[PDB]
Amino acid sequence: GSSGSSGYVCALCLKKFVSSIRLRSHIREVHGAAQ
């Protein structure tokens, strides 16, 4: 995982999450970042 901390943070809205999956999926739900 990441170095230090207890969670992962959005690069867009700077919100914190319990996991890298909870972060990855947040971006698709509200920032709409597709492929």
Binding-site positions for Zn(2+) read: 10, 13, 26, 31
Could you tell me if 32 and 21 are in contact, meaning their C-beta atoms sit under 8 angstroms apart?
no
| Phi, psi values for residue 27, rounded to 5° | -60, -40
Distance CA 31, CA 35 (A): 13
Least Å distance, CB 15 to Zn ion, is 5
Query: Minimal distance in Å, beta carbon 23 to Zn ion?
Result: 8
- Selected from 7, 9, 13, 19, the binder of Zn ion by CB under 5 A is 13
Instruction: State yes or no: residue 10 binds Zn ion (CB under 5 A).
Output: yes
